[PDB]
């Protein structure tokens, strides 16, 4: 999915805009907006993270996909559900914001790619089995 890709960029742009940073490096609309409020709702409710997750990752430009993958896997240690996909997306957002705080802005489009790879590979199967983003919208939107 180029579609999945678009979700990722839209989510991460939203978070970057929201938190006072640039987003320059860059039904659908209903999915997008539902995911936008879902992360906000998950971040307010938690403040839990990222945790030793971003902690666990300490991203640099020498970081490769596989390390990202290894960390994000801890989220899905009990398999997938809608909440953990919310957290996966909020996770990506936090990692973009840290990247920019460390003056590592190049990473932002990289992190976006990883997220889209990880999504399309490990998450799309479960998502498709449980009703697609339609259901995500029935439950969140």
From Swiss-Prot:
GO terms for biological process: apoptotic process; apoptotic process in bone marrow cell; cellular response to alkaloid; cellular response to amino acid stimulus; cellular response to gamma radiation; defense response to virus; dendritic cell apoptotic process; dendritic cell proliferation. GO terms for cellular component: Bcl-2 family protein complex; centrosome; cytosol; endoplasmic reticulum; membrane; mitochondrial inner membrane; mitochondrial matrix; mitochondrial membrane. GO terms for molecular function: BH3 domain binding; identical protein binding; protein kinase binding. It comes from the Eukaryota. It is found in: Mitochondrion membrane; Nucleus membrane; Cytoplasm, Cytoskeleton, Microtubule organizing center, Centrosome. Proteolytically cleaved by caspases during apoptosis. The cleaved protein, lacking the BH4 motif, has pro-apoptotic activity. It is a single-pass membrane protein. A motif (BH3) lies at residues 31-45. A motif (BH1) lies at residues 74-93. A motif (BH4) lies at residues 3-23. A motif (BH2) lies at residues 125-140. Widely expressed, with highest levels in the brain, thymus, bone marrow, and kidney. Bcl-X(L) and Bcl-X(delta-TM) expression is enhanced in B- and T-lymphocytes that have been activated. Belongs to the Bcl-2 family. Potent inhibitor of cell death. Inhibits activation of caspases. Appears to regulate cell death by blocking the voltage-dependent anion channel (VDAC) by binding to it and preventing the release of the caspase activator, CYC1, from the mitochondrial membrane. Also acts as a regulator of G2 checkpoint and progression to cytokinesis during mitosis. The BH4 motif is required for anti-apoptotic activity. The BH1 and BH2 motifs are required for both heterodimerization with other Bcl-2 family members and for repression of cell death. Homodimer. Interacts with BAD. Interacts with PGAM5. Interacts with HEBP2. Interacts with p53/TP53 and BBC3; interaction with BBC3 disrupts the interaction with p53/TP53. Interacts with ATP5F1A and ATP5F1B; the interactions mediate the association of isoform Bcl-X(L) with the mitochondrial membrane ATP synthase F(1)F(0) ATP synthase. Interacts with VDAC1. Interacts with BCL2L11 (via BH3). Interacts with RNF183. Interacts with GIMAP3/IAN4 and GIMAP5/IAN5. Interacts with GIMAP5 and HSPA8/HSC70; the interaction between HSPA8 and BCL2L1 is impaired in the absence of GIMAP5. This is Bcl-2-like protein 1. It comes from Mus musculus (Mouse). The gene is Bcl2l1.
